[PDB]
């Protein structure tokens, strides 16, 4: 058995891509998108017809919207159209991320999430097949608490800190996506490291291990999904995690190796949360950075939509 | 005849001394003075104030025999920061700034409580609230706290200001005074760009930040005092001549006192979600606000450990 197939025995394998054509090579259970991956699927142009049809559809269904509102509605429908194509090739769920610009507004986050779900449902996809990805700021967590109460399952993303993860679980979220790679990136930058750290010393791997241990010892039922990978050894290190979302490149690396895979993994108030985050210099920087960078990619996507109206 | 750079500055800007070392303050005759948790730790640890620190720990211990150890340490820490403030007030005409415990920085209600506790300790010694500014980190929760404190006549000094949005929100809250930082912003600039020498004044991100806030405030007619803080060299201070106020370390005060070159005058609505977005967009501000709270917290924990070692 390949390492990929070994991993599937102990972990829910998830594909991290909007390039739905790649997903059948790997037979993951679930798939995840993010604003950068949607932009890449739009930019690389394998799906220009899907984009063009989406734009036409939204214009016809929305004669009342001005150019700004129309572009926003198209951005949502693009996210959903990719998700629908992904759902055609997997048995599980797809994750679709809200506009990062709403990250500090629980209200607009709730509305955005509900609009994504409504668009899926209008296209005949039931909400049980979708996770709404939300950056794990306090405001995102508070939004997810409400959405979960209303039956909308959330994927809390940009998780860099254990207390941050704990708060998510306290809110009853379906799933959390603690990051690995971006933490390793910070670690390597801090000391100008030229090579990846040994696995035992990899701050990103250790961050997910710590969250896993917290959740299992405490009996939290939220799914732990490691995300953000720089090398295949980081993914292998976390075998046994509830779920791991993995790029098509790294899925291919796992598919082509066949050594033995060792299985390794077997209330907070607002003020408390803000304090614990502030104590984590890396998490404070990297949460903020993720929201800035995803916003830049969403603006690039909007500019592409505008050029094709 | 032409006076020193210091005396010329005093003519056009309220000169403030940035130190817990009250003995040094009298050599410079500032109007006001500022402390912060790091400066209080430095004054507590230095040999020359060891009698004042000793006497403070004794008096609180004697008058509070029934406090649990956690409460007792907290009471001594507030007494030490107030006792240095009082020694400063004895040697100046104006106000002293005393910072709340940095651990309350994300809690408006405990900020308000800590501020009131500081004021009460001053008042217990006969010092009226009009001689004290409560220094509060300009997180959203600190701005909310300060808005409420100002409604009760407690003047605040909103510190760790790194972005024009904080500054604007502070003004909108009606705070008495803001402390936009210079030096720490230049530190970020110099570390990030590998700068061997300090940037030209025109290119100094820190100096430009205070200039932008000053311009914002005067164009909007805000009455909040703009006090530049955090300096790395005299040239950054001189660059801001004419700002409402400038708080300056004793090393830099001494440099200004001894220079006689001519001083040219250079300086003559936000929702929570908006504030948080604009802060987020500023990588430097996000990092430096957080770091400042962390570092002040580390120094206050060291103060607490020193209190515990002397009990």
Position of tokens 């690389």? A44
Least Cα distance to B40 among B309, B311, B303 occurs for B303
HEC states along B201-232?
HHHCHHHHHHHHHHHHHHHHCCCCEEEEECCC
| b (16+ CB within 10 A) / e for A177-197 | bbbbbbbbbbbbeeeeeeebb
Residue of B nearest to A273 (CA): B106
For the record, the structure tokens of A62 come out as: 């929305």
**A1-309 is classed CATH 1.10.10.60:** no
Q: Which residue of B has its CA nearest to A284?
A: B287
**What are the residue numbers of the active site of A?**
133
CB atoms within 10 A of CB B223: 10
Q: Are A261 and A13 in contact (CB under 8 A)?
A: no
Asked whether the beta carbons of residue A275 and residue B103 sit closer than 8 angstroms, the reply is: yes
Burial annotation A285-300 (CB, 10 A radius, 16+ → b, else e): bbbbbbbbebbebbee
CA angle A279-B34-B2, nearest 5°? 135
CATH number of B1-311: 3.20.20.70
Rounded CA separation A185/A167 (Å):
24
- What are the structural domain ranges in chain B? 1-311
C-alpha distance from A250 to closest chain B C-alpha (Å): 31
* A139, two tokens: 């405001």
Among A100, A104, A160, A161, pick the best mutation site for testing chain B contact (most B Cβ within 10 A): A104
- Is B107 in Cβ contact with A271 (below 8 Å)? yes
* Nearest 10 degrees: Cα torsion A21, A26, A32, A38: -30
Do B214 and B207 touch, CB atoms closer than 8 A?
no
Q: Which of A134, A160, A159 lies closest to A145 in space, CA to CA?
A: A134
Contact between B294 and B103 under an 8 Å Cβ cutoff? The reply is no
Contact yes or no for B169/B132 (Cβ under 8 A): no
Q: Is A191 helix (H, G, I), strand (E, B) or coil?
A: coil
Beta-carbon contacts of residue B54 (< 8 Å; ≥ 6 apart): B310
Are the CB atoms for A86 and A20 separated by under 8 Å? Answer: yes
> Contact, B119 vs B134, CB < 8 A?
yes
User: How close B284 comes to chain A (CA, Å)?
Assistant: 9
Among the partner-chain residues B106, B287, B293, the one whose CB lies closest to the CB of A285 is B287
Contact A274 B103 (CB under 8 A): no
Catalytic residues of B: 135
Breaks in chain B (C–N beyond 2.5 Å) sit after 268
Give chain B as a 3 state SS string: CCCCHHHHHHHHCEEEEECCCHHHHCCCCCCEEECCHHHHHHHHHCHHHHHHHHHHHHHHHHHCCCCCHHHHHHHHHHHHHHHHHHHHHCCCCCCEEEECCHHHCCCHHHHHHHHHHHHHHHHHCCCCHHHEEEEEECCHHHHHHHHHHHHCCCCEEEEEECCHHHHHHHHHCCCCEEEEECHHHHHHHHHHCCCCCCCCHHHCHHHHHHHHHHHHHHHHCCCCEEEEECCCCHHHHHCCCCCCEEEECHHHHHHHHCCCCCCCCCCCCCCHHHHHHHHHHCHHHHHHHHHHHHHHHHHHHHHHHHHHHCC
Given resolution (angstroms): 1.5
Q: Which of A122, A110, A123 is nearest to A151 (CA)?
A: A110
Chain A and chain B share a number of CB contacts under 8 A equal to 47
| Cβ-based interface (< 8 Å): residues of B facing A | 103, 105-107, 110, 139, 141, 272-273, 276-277, 280-281, 283, 286-287, 290-291, 293-294
Give how far B106 is from chain A: nearest CA, Å: 5
- This structure was determined by X-ray
Q: Which of B34, B10, B12, B20 is nearest to B177 (CA)?
A: B34
Chain A nearest-CA distance from B276, in A, is 6
φ, ψ (nearest 5 deg) of residue B189: -55, -45
């Amino acid at each position: 058995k390949s390492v990929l197939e070994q991993l599937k025995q102990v972990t829910m394998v998830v594909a991290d891509t909007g390039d739905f054509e790649l997903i059948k090579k790997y037979k993951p259970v679930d798939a995840t998108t993010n604003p950068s991956l949607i932009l890449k699927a739009v930019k690389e142009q394998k799906y220009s017809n899907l984009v063009a049809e989406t734009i036409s559809k939204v214009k016809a269904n929305n004669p009342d919207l001005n150019s700004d509102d129309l572009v926003k509605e198209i951005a949502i429908e693009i996210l959903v159209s990719f998700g629908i194509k992904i759902l055609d090739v997997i048995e599980g769920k797809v994750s679709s991320e809200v506009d990062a610009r709403v990250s500090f507004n629980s209200a607009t986050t709730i509305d955005y999430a509900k609009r994504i779900i409504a668009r899926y449902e209008s296209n005949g996809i039931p909400k049980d097949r979708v996770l709404i990805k939300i950056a794990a700021t306090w405001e995102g967590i508070k939004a997810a608490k409400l959405l979960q109460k209303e039956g909308i399952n959330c994927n809390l993303t940009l998780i860099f800190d254990k207390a941050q993860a704990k708060a998510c679980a306290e809110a009853g979220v379906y799933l959390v996506s603690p990051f690995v790679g971006r933490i390793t990136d910070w670690q390597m930058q801090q000391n100008n490291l030229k090579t990846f750290p040994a696995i035992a010393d990899d701050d990103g791997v250790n961050s997910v291990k710590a969250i896993y241990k917290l959740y299992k010892s405490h009996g939290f039922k939220t799914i732990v999904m490691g995300a953000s990978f720089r090398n295949v050894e980081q993914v292998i290190a976390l075998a046994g995690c509830d779920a791991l979302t993995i790029s098509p490149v790294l899925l291919e690396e796992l598919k082509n190796r066949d050594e033995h895979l060792e299985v390794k993994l077997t209330q907070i108030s607002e003020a408390d949360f803000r304090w614990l985050m502030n104590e984590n210099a890396m998490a404070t920087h990297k949460l903020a950075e993720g929201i800035r960078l995803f916003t830049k990619d969403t603006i690039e996507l909007e500019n592409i939509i505008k050029q094709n109206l």
